[PDB]
Amino acid sequence: AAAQVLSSVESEIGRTTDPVRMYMREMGTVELLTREGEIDIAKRIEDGINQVQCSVAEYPEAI
DNA sequence: TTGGTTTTTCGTGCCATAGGTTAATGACTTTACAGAGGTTACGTTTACATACATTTGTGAATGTATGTACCATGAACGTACCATAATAGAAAGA
């Protein structure tokens, strides 16, 4: 959703081999998250860890 | 009157009687080689006490080992002198 700006950037770039500008042009796609926006990410982490632990608990020979 | 055959002495040559230095094998005798017999001072073999090493446990040096819970949201963070010409490349008008 941000490659249209990166194409116009790379049209100006004369094959820069320095990884610093390359790194801080690939990392600039995702913007800043909000303060309470990562709470839902943490809850999805909770749901994933709980699903893995339920999959372990349904295995009978783990005990 | 002169040359040459004949003849006799005489010192010289040949033969025989005497008598002495010195070769012979030996018998020497002296030196050298061959025979055993008592004595010396080592050279190899053996046992025994003590020593440096080398083999063990035990008290200290470091070293990775995982974490610390007000708030920390994009940049190079100071690099650098700018020579010269063979050979290609990506486009721009011929």
From TrEMBL:
It is found in: Cytoplasm. Signal peptide: none annotated. Sigma factors are initiation factors that promote the attachment of RNA polymerase to specific initiation sites and are then released. This sigma factor is the primary sigma factor during exponential growth. Belongs to the sigma-70 factor family. RpoD/SigA subfamily. Interacts transiently with the RNA polymerase catalytic core. This is RNA polymerase sigma factor RpoD. It comes from Escherichia coli. The lineage of its organism: Bacteria, Pseudomonadati, Pseudomonadota, Gammaproteobacteria, Enterobacterales. The gene is rpoD. The chain holds residues 79 to 141 of 613 of the full protein.
